[PDB]
Write a protein that binds this ligand. Structure first.
Ligand SMILES: Nc1nc2c(ncn2[C@@H]2O[C@H](COP(=O)(O)OP(=O)(O)OP(=O)(O)O)[C@@H](O)[C@H]2O)c(=O)[nH]1
Ligand SMILES: Nc1ncnc2c1ncn2[C@@H]1O[C@H](COP(=O)(O)OP(=O)(O)OP(=O)(O)O)[C@@H](O)[C@H]1O
Ligand SMILES: Nc1ncnc2c1ncn2[C@@H]1O[C@H](COP(=O)(O)OP(=O)(O)OP(=O)(O)O)[C@@H](O)[C@H]1O
Ligand SMILES: C[S@@+](CC[C@H](N)C(=O)[O-])C[C@H]1O[C@@H](n2cnc3c(N)ncnc32)[C@H](O)[C@@H]1O
Ligand SMILES: C[S@@+](CC[C@H](N)C(=O)[O-])C[C@H]1O[C@@H](n2cnc3c(N)ncnc32)[C@H](O)[C@@H]1O
Ligand SMILES: [Mg+2]
Ligand SMILES: [Mg+2]
Lengths: 49, 1057, 76, 76
């Protein structure tokens, strides 16, 4: 739970920036597959420590 | 120094071992050593472990079998703290024992070992065709000519290339790699050109200007973002390298153009390629932020894409449209030539344009890293201004800037216990003087003292002024950090005032260590506590001046006559715990135990006596003046009768009250009471309350009455003000050259682009202005700037609005501050006492000058850096004759100020004083131009010459400041003078050389002999309040003690014609 | 000294941060420091723990999720 | 009642400082609460609160049970 709160405070998803940096949402939302073609990626798989 | 000097070498080839060193390259026998074999580090803020092998192992692919080792389990094992060095070493060692690269050692000395292919084969556990080739023919790894090492595996396998995964440098992270390095079988330049051309037909690939082992290699990126971060890191590497090459230093660059060449990439990578090749000046100035490097780089391209310069714009565009070409300076190109000369078959990237770099003259200031800039704004500059727009400053959160009321006073502890004296001067007290002084004291009592003085006295409390210091002594003592101090020492008394617990030395100069688990509460102190201590110290210094120990003598007593809780009685009782037999008791009408509760005068039955008394009686009740007078009289009478060394308070020290006290002591039978007025540094800085010091002496006291005493002037000159007190505003709108601002300070923030404009405008008001950004990411720059009356008095003399805007724009964006920590400004900044006395004298002379009609100019001789500018009205012309003054012909012409810049001659015939002129001689007569002290007879002589020289003049007004002799009599007996001194009978204010003082009687007598009009005036209390209210200054304690006796003994002669 | 001298200001408004300071207002990078970021105290006579955040956090509603954190399990 | 009491203490301390002529950074000039609808007792607190009785400055009241003393003060 604690690590979870720290992870999900960052955001459930992120977008790669044109400059290449990740930008996490800061929001806790359920993923939908409509998002798969969207700019967003699931944040579990960011591999950002 | 144009030509580059460099020694290019294939460092990566040099890293590859001889085949014979491969067996021991792990050093199986010995443990890996920190800083040589490995580089562990734990960043606690990031909670991220980072191990990094040195030597050949810096390039090392890991087999999943290698990743199954406990060494890599370690960071998970210690989520929050550093891996202990023992575990790191033992796991790193056992894993080193785990590795064994295939090799065939041979006796040829030309041979090397293909480290890359061997570690790769091992990492794939020899499953790839390269791993097969290596497991069957290890000898293929050995090589003489570096290139052939790969050609051998290209021919033998029949493949055109090999895709080697890259290594992460930090062996701990197992994250997927951004890209990977393909290696091509292209021995000739032609084969290389063809591969490059074909590479420009395919997605997301790039390559270096030249390659290691002279073998062509291409990076293939898994995404655009990976390509961007890679190109960025390389641009930083190339820029740093070129930055070093252009300094003419020899460099061991492994390659001449460190940056990557896109072969196919998106828009953004092409932009990075372009500004990268440009080598923009902005990098060298640190104008870019490297915290998010690529971002800034992209932004930089955006400027260059539309750059104000035509050459740089067209150059950037042209580079953007031919990204595949490798742009490089001529000076790089000659290095490429030297490289191709030393190694005729070296491969390097063939498509290459050679541009001449475009010079740019704009030297931006910049500094990433913490520290706010404290600008000193110039009054004027090359830039002109016309109707500048109002510059709004933003609201600032308390997260960034807090505005405390008064600056706490940093100070040495001993300085708290100082006091100043004022001895009586008059030999007689005429009855008409008694009626005059009584009328004065009654009129002054009936209508309350100045409201502004009350505001300052009630705002600048001594308790808060001392609080950070007294607590600090408590905090150190609580940690046991304090150790050595003498028994009677003032530091010891401060310690007793800081902690409630009794202290005890274990021996000479050594306090006892705290018992375990004991953390005694800080001593509770009211506002008068430290003052009462300082009065006790004063009596100790009065019984004999030379004493260092402050402990009371055995078999002696003291009384603190005014009492309540009276913490000082407890502190004093505990300070003297080691002295045998000593009474120490308070005795108020409100007194709580230990102190006896009793009224004064004492009941006729009760017997009260002591060797010392410290009265602090003060009736809270509003009352008739006659009752206040009779009560204070009876209090001084009983205080003097009861002790040989009374230290009575005088709440309303008019000349009448003090003189009535002297007359009353005169009336007591058979004893002659020597007396002196006194003021400790622990008093509230603004209080006019004064402590008379009564003692008996066998001799009758010549000159016992007071007249025009300093301590008395502090009170009597204060009177009810016509105006409301000047509350210090915080301004938020910087108008252009407006002159409407009430005293206070500008405070807020602006977009950093607008910052140079803001500093350009507030130069009109504030003399100096601290500024800072909070972070590299947030564009707003915070700015704080106290309003200087002197800068207003200078800048507003004329309507011209020049400034150094052109210089201030060299600051944006990194050149004007960084500070994450919240800053704390005060509405009342500390200033040394001499500075306050200067501002007071200026308020006196300025108010005096505004009254005079029809004067063409102010001639301030010895005016230094326009120090007297505040005094002169904006309309009339100002003149300076200080040799030390710097010349600024533009500032002088623009602001209406002549500067003679020559030593003023005091001989009367040579001297030429203009009519309708105000001649300031503020502290100039007491010194020679070179700064050596002028002997007092020469000072009275030059004052006499200024006097005789203006006798012919019709309308002229001299203001000759000087030092009266009486102060040396008073400072010899005082303690509170950290600034002022008395080295061999001469005053030594500030850092100035010691200087002999004039006697006022002989000076006035001489001026009467000359017959010129004269009036010895000194600045009073309202001038002090005006100075502090206008400049935003709080007085401070040592200043409060010394300012009365100092101000009174800097008379300002006012010659008038 | 009849007339009052005072500088009234909306201190509560001053406590509210610029939008840019909000990202780092937690100061994620560094540990909270006693007497600046927080004010812990234990009254042994009352046996009552008392933590009190400084800065903007002095005004801070807690989600039940925030109250589920071990920090709040500490006094027990 | 407890709220009005704490506010009365805040306003009284503030006014006690204002009447000394010291400059103050009061966030608001009259710190005490105004009932819009309350019971008898809160109206009593409102009244002695607004009075600024001398008894506070003398420390004649005990703050250990502030509202109680305040109620008693109104009774006098
Ligand atoms: N797996 C593996 N990769 C290597 C080895 N040597 C070099 N490389 C990789 O090959 C790439 C090309 O080599 P370089 O010309 O040195 O490129 P580079 O980016 O300047 O390398 P750096 O020294 O880290 O800056 C680099 O990114 C390295 O990561 C090796 O021995 N093993
Ligand atoms: N820094 C640049 N360098 C070269 N060309 C650019 C640059 N910025 C924009 N362009 C040109 O403009 C087009 C992009 O338009 P635009 O600038 O509106 O959006 P963008 O790609 O997000 O760039 P920016 O971030 O500058 O807005 C590209 O096709 C490119 O040719
Ligand atoms: N302190 C007071 N201030 C104003 N009115 C009061 C006060 N005390 C009593 N009263 C008036 O008297 C009535 C209450 O009667 P009484 O005083 O006998 O009992 P109470 O409410 O407990 O007050 P107390 O505690 O003074 O006895 C109320 O309706 C009120 O109008
Ligand atoms: C300004 S206070 C300072 C006392 C002491 N320094 C302290 O604060 O602990 C002076 C006290 O003396 C008391 N006092 C006033 N007039 C007195 C008198 N005539 N005789 C005895 N005590 C008196 C008052 O009650 C007042 O509390
Ligand atoms: C104490 S400083 C300035 C004091 C005061 N703040 C003011 O501006 O008048 C006095 C200056 O006067 C200059 N000075 C001293 N003797 C002088 C002389 N005989 N003629 C002209 N300037 C003199 C010195 O250079 C010195 O810097
Ligand atoms: Mg390299
Ligand atoms: Mg509030």
């Amino acid at each position: 739970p604690v690590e979870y709160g720290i992870f999900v405070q960052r955001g459930a998803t992120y977008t790669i920036n044109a400059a290449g940096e990740f930008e996490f949402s800061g929001r806790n939302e359920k993923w939908d597959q409509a998002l798969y073609l969207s700019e967003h990626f699931p944040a579990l798989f960011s591999d950002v420590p | 120094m144009w030509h580059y000097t460099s020694i290019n070498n294939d460092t990566r080839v040099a890293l590859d071992p001889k085949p014979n060193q491969i067996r021991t390259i792990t050093k199986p026998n010995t443990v890996p050593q920190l800083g040589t074999d490995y580089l562990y580090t734990f960043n606690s803020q990031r909670r991220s472990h980072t191990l990094r092998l040195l030597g050949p192992f810096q390039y090392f692919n890991f087999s999943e079998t290698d990743r199954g080792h406990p060494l890599f389990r370690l960071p998970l094992k210690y989520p929050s703290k550093a891996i202990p060095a023992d575990e790191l070493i033992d796991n790193l060692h056992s894993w080193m024992r785990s590795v064994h690269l295939l090799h065939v050692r041979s006796e040829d000395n030309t041979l090397r070992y293909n480290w890359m292919l061997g570690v790769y084969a091992r990492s794939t556990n020899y499953t790839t065709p390269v791993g097969q080739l290596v497991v069957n023919a290890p000898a293929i790894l050995n090589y003489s000519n570096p290139q052939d090492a790969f050609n051998s595996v290209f021919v033998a396998l029949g493949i055109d290339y090999i895709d080697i995964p890259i290594t992460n440098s930090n062996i701990f992270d197992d994250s997927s790699t951004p890209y990977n390095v393909r290696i091509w079988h292209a021995p000739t330049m032609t084969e290389v050109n063809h591969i490059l051309a074909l590479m420009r037909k395919s997605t997301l690939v790039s390559t270096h200007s030249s390659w290691h082992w002279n073998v062509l290699h291409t990076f293939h990126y898994r995404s655009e973002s990976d390509m961007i971060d890679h190109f960025a890191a390389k641009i930083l590497e190339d820029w740093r390298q070129k930055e070093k090459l252009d300094k003419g230093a020899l460099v061991e660059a492994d390659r001449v153009i460190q940056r990557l060449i896109p072969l196919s990439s998106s828009t953004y990578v092409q932009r990075l390629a372009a500004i990268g090749a440009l080598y923009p000046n902005e990098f060298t100035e640190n104008v870019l932020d490297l915290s998010r490097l690529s971002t800034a780089l992209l932004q930089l391209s955006d400027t260059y894409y539309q750059h104000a310069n035509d050459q740089l714009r067209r150059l950037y565009r042209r580079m953007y449209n031919d990204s595949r070409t490798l742009y490089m300076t001529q000076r790089h190109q000659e290095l490429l030539l030297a490289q191709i000369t030393a190694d005729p078959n070296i491969l390097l990237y063939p498509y290459t344009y050679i541009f001449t770099t475009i010079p740019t003259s704009m030297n931006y200031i910049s500094n990433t890293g913490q520290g706010r800039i404290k600008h000193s704004l110039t009054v004027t500059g090359a830039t002109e201004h016309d109707t500048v727009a109002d510059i709004v400053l933003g609201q600032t959160g308390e997260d960034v800037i807090t505005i405390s009321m008064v600056e706490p006073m940093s100070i040495a502890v001993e300085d708290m216990y100082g006091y100043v004296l004022d001895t009586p001067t008059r030999d007689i007290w005429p009855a008409d003087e008694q009626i005059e002084q009584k009328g004065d004291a009654v009129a002054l009592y009936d209508t309350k003292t100045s409201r502004a003085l009350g505001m300052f006295n009630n705002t600048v409390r001594i308790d808060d002024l001392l609080s950070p210091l007294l607590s600090l002594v408590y905090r150190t003592y609580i940690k046991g950090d304090t150790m050595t101090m003498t028994q009677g020492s003032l530091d010891h008394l401060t310690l007793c005032a800081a902690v409630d617990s009794d202290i005890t030395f274990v021996g000479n100069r050594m306090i006892a260590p705290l018992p375990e688990g004991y953390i005694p509460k800080p001593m509770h102190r009211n506002n008068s506590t430290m003052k009462m201590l300082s009065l006790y110290v004063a009596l100790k210094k009065l019984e004999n001046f030379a004493t260092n120990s402050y402990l009371m003598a055995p078999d002696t007593s003291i009384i603190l006559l005014g009492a309540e809780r009276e913490p000082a009685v407890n502190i004093l009782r505990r300070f003297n715990r080691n002295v045998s037999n000593v009474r120490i008791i308070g005795m108020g009408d409100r007194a709580v135990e230990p102190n006896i509760r009793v009224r004064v005068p004492f009941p006729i039955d009760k017997n009260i006596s002591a060797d010392f008394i410290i009265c602090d009686i003060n009736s809270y009740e509003d009352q008739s003046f006659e009752s206040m007078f009779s009560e204070t009289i009876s209090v001084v009478t009983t205080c003097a009768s009861a002790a040989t060394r009374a230290l009575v308070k005088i709440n309303h020290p008019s000349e009448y009250m003090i003189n009535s006290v002297i007359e009353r002591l005169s009336q007591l039978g058979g004893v002659f009471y020597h007396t002196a007025l006194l003021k400790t540094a622990s008093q509230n800085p603004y209080s006019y309350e004064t402590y008379i010091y009564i003692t008996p002496i066998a001799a009758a006291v010549r000159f016992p009455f007071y007249s025009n005493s300093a301590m008395i002037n502090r009170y009597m000159t204060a009177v009810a003000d016509d105006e409301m007190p000047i509350i210090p505003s915080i301004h938020t709108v910087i108008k252009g050259h407006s002159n409407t601002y009430s005293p206070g300070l500008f405070c807020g923030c602006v977009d950093v682009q607008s910052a140079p404009l803001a500093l350009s405008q507030l130069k009109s008001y504030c003399s100096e202005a601290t500024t800072w950004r909070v972070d590299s990411d947030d564009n707003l720059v915070n700015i704080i700037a106290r309003i200087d009356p002197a800068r207003i008095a200078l800048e507003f003399r004329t309507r011209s609005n020049t400034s150094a805007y052109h210089e201030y724009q060299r600051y944006v964006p990194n050149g004007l501050g960084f500070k994450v920590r919240k800053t704390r400004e005060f509405r009342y900044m500390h200033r040394e006492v001499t500075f306050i006395h200067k501002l007071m004298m200026y308020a006196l002379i300025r108010e005096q000058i505004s009254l005079t009609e029809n004067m063409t100019q102010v001639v301030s001789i010895g005016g230094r850096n326009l120090a007297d500018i505040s005094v002169v009205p904006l309309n009339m012309k100002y003149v300076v004759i200080d040799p030390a003054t710097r010349i600024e012909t533009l500032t002088q012409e623009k602001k209406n100020i002549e500067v003679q810049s020559r030593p003023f001659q005091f001989d009367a015939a040579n001297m030429d004083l203009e009519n309708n002129s105000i001649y300031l001689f503020i502290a100039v007569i007491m010194n020679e131009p070179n700064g050596a002290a002028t002997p007092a007879r020469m000072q009275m002589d030059k004052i006499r010459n200024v006097a005789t020289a203006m006798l012919t003049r019709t309308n002229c007004v001299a203001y000759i400041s000087f030092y009266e002799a009486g102060i040396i009599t008073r400072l010899d007996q005082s303690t509170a003078h950290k600034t002022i001194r008395v080295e061999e009978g001469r005053l030594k204010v500030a850092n100035y050389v010691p200087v002999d003082t004039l006697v006022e009687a002989d000076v006035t007598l001489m001026l009467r002999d000359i017959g010129i009009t004269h009036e010895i005036i000194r600045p009073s209390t309202p001038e002090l309040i005006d100075a502090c209210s206008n400049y935003g200054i709080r007085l401070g304690s040592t200043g409060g003690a010394v300012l009365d006796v100092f101000n009174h003994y800097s008379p300002v002669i006012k010659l008038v014609r």
